[PDB]
Design a protein around this ligand. Structure first.
Ligand SMILES: [NH3+][C@@]1(C(=O)O)C[C@H]2C[NH2+]C[C@H]2[C@@H]1CCC[B-](O)(O)O
Ligand SMILES: [NH3+][C@@]1(C(=O)O)C[C@H]2C[NH2+]C[C@H]2[C@@H]1CCC[B-](O)(O)O
Ligand SMILES: [NH3+][C@@]1(C(=O)O)C[C@H]2C[NH2+]C[C@H]2[C@@H]1CCC[B-](O)(O)O
Ligand SMILES: [Mn+2]
Ligand SMILES: [Mn+2]
Ligand SMILES: [Mn+2]
Ligand SMILES: [Mn+2]
Ligand SMILES: [Mn+2]
Ligand SMILES: [Mn+2]
Lengths: 317, 319, 318
């Protein structure tokens, strides 16, 4: 099935943020048996490999924005790789790597399917612009580079002149928010972007969240969905090995509910599994707990259901 | 005392339905934790019937892959007789396990007295593998297949199960908490049209709506006896770690108590099973006491213990 | 904003219960950066300091009820202190301290706003009377002294002659209940007090629980809201450093939801943060986890929102 036809892309990149180890995300995800598990789940899996992110000397900061040229380039390569996966009729599965990579993954998916909708699962909005940022870390800015409404608000940042804003404010839905900067909250509110912060999740229940999310995105007619999954969207009791963890997060169950629901639309077209950093587990057990959760989430995106699965044969004869 | 709180305790120290030793020590640790005395503090009329003496079968050869077939079959045979006895005395049978294979007997025996019973099966697993579909060969993952009338023809003649006569239809069983269902089992679940609430349905609806829909489904037409078969692995292993087949993403302590509190409120609980408590499977003694304390909290809630409080029919302000 | 105009009262008092260390709740709550964190979120914060509760050495039990004069005098002083804070047009924030202090906090607050409505977040009903109690600890009795319907059922306890019942049974709502004594259950049910035990929270979800809570207390008419928060209302995995923990509690998320919803009424008028005991965790991280959770609850009462917060300026054009 097209909903189980995948193109894996390794994106070992850390320079959208300062904590070392996130570049190991694709490694520890492959080591956990992701591809073998997808194949056992009746998936058509093609491995596009791990992108070779060539190091850039003298990557001077843009104002306080760190490694602009390195971040801009990694996303540039990825956009090209994602568009290749999409032309081949595969669902793109981006193994991160920090969340700056969402610039390249969403941009490449949008060159093939410009009518896509984005579901952004995360404790953070990642919507600071190179001007509103106080950290200078680009993994906190990808949504700003992608939005149509922000065109003219993004300065000419070295490494990013290839970026054509490809998503409108109406086409993104945030799930999981609980650590949004003042400037970010200003942007989310003035752009009227649809969002379910942890407050809305507590208020409505994940069941209603998913119902409204999907009705908002797919009400009119069918269209491709891009799921951008920052693993910090889940509570640090499930995914501790991540660079910016925030307590009171989505549960392991809520993470499976969201992805089980997206799988059932049969419209998942692009997926990012981001911010896994195996150098940040307090114990090797915290690393394994996180990696296991990221794999579970990925498997649900491609059909693994808690109620069970079976081949269309007769199991009693 | 109220029928809702009139109980017949049956201990079932049985482990040959699965490969991990220690589950036969389940009714020992539960009794040691003060279960029978806690129920008496709750205004319960509690009669202990003792622990069933399970005999050894030395030459218990396998039926294909199916392990210890005679041991498991006779175990449940001795339990259906003891359960039918408790039900004739007008008490709620309370089966302390022991592995889930014992459900064959507990439900078989309860069905001999109240054939109109409904079953609520709280487990991470369906336990609906037939001796033919199973890939593990363990009978603790097979009880429901032996109980369903619709699987009459698909169950071979395993040594030790001759007495078994399927007593429930697919319309008379509700699963809550499913999250580790084999392909053979999922086919059986979907072909037979069994009502179920996996972790997906629990997340979607909330435990409030799960219990409203479960109870309406089973009771809504006519009032009937309830058989609750509770596999402690239905709850997440952060609450019941000391179990043979733990599965992450389970029901919480709160959902567990919510489930059992609602069943008590019906006033129709007629049979109960507290299964798969294995005290030799804790990583630490703390993990064992936690599994044991939770199993006790779940049990007490089945017989009236309410989180909002409990009081005797007296004036507490002017006694 | 008046919903962000605060008056801090430290009430370092532990004699409402037997476990030493709860009197450090104000110390440890301040040290976690509370006042600063509040000023950071645009609040106008005044600190009235910690009350000096002078020793009351001759304090014989009233039957089994321990330290009656000490608990009585502490709430009496706090009631005058809260009434002063309310007269200065500031929301009272009482940093506890054991929960017996809510006699004084609710009493003083009622002196200025007698139409107030109570929200009591707790694993316990704290409604035993000096006669129904079996522990004889006054932190488990505050509600009984404050209810008008129990006037006739409260004996003359030394240190409490100043108490006048200020709230009717209809004007209090419980959330989080899971460890209620039989006598307390008999009182709760006989008075028809509105409650949401952990069973109701599981049945409806916190969203519906907060909808019904604010409809029940604000339906007839908008009035001041007094939130009395016992940190043991939240599950011990979030607030372990407390004297009477009970498993199966409110989650960290549910605690924020309650208080975020309370903030958005713009009617929070009084707030108790009670039962933090930094001498009672298993580890120092368990102490810091409790304190941080109490701080988080506190900030959510004064407008910290998980969706985000921003000043009325153009962040794209500074
Ligand atoms: N909004 C931040 C940013 O760096 O722009 C502030 C930082 C402090 N809290 C976490 C950090 C945010 C970045 C989030 C990036 B992430 O994890 O969602 O990919
Ligand atoms: N369906 C199983 C089986 O053994 O039949 C597969 C095994 C691997 N995961 C758990 C095992 C299942 C049986 C569990 C039975 B129990 O624990 O629910 O009583
Ligand atoms: N209801 C109690 C009481 O002391 O009256 C019984 C005691 C045993 N369990 C906990 C104790 C109760 C008081 C708790 C007061 B608290 O924590 O909410 O301040
Ligand atoms: Mn994030
Ligand atoms: Mn992110
Ligand atoms: Mn079972
Ligand atoms: Mn099971
Ligand atoms: Mn209290
Ligand atoms: Mn309490």
């Amino acid at each position: 099935a097209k909903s189980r036809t995948i193109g894996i892309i390794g994106a070992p990149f850390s320079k959208g943020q300062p904590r070392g180890g996130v570049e190991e995300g694709p490694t520890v995800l492959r080591k956990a048996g992701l591809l073998e598990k997808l194949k056992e789940q009746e998936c058509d899996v093609k491995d596009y490999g791990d992108l070779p992110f060539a190091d850039i000397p003298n990557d001077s900061p843009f104002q306080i924005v760190k490694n602009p040229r390195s971040v801009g380039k990694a996303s540039e390569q990825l956009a090209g790789k994602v568009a290749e996966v999409k032309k081949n009729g595969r669902i793109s599965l981006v193994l991160g790597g920090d969340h700056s990579l969402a610039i390249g993954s969403i941009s490449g998916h949008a060159r093939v399917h410009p009518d896509l909708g984005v579901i952004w699962v995360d404790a953070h909005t990642d919507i600071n612009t190179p001007l509103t940022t106080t950290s200078g870390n680009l993994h906190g800015q990808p949504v700003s580079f992608l939005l149509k409404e922000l065109k003219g608000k993004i300065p000419d940042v070295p490494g990013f002149s290839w970026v054509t804003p490809c998503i409108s404010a109406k086409d993104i839905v945030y799930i999981g928010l609980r650590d949004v900067d003042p400037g970010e909250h200003y942007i989310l509110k003035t752009l009227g972007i649809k969002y379910f912060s942890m407050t809305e999740v507590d208020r409505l229940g994940i069941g209603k969240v998913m119902e409204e999310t999907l009705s908002y995105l797919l009400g009119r007619k069918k269209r491709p969905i891009h799921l951008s999954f920052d693993v910090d969207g889940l509570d640090p009791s499930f995914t501790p090995a991540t660079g910016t963890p925030v307590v009171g997060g989505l549960t392991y169950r809520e993470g499976l509910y969201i992805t089980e629901e997206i799988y059932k639309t049969g419209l998942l077209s692009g997926l990012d599994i981001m911010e896994v950093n195996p150098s940040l587990g307090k114990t090797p057990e915290e690393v394994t707990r996180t990696v296991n959760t990221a794999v579970a989430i990925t498997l649900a995106c491609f059909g693994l259901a808690r109620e069970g699965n079976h081949k269309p044969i007769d199991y009693l004869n």
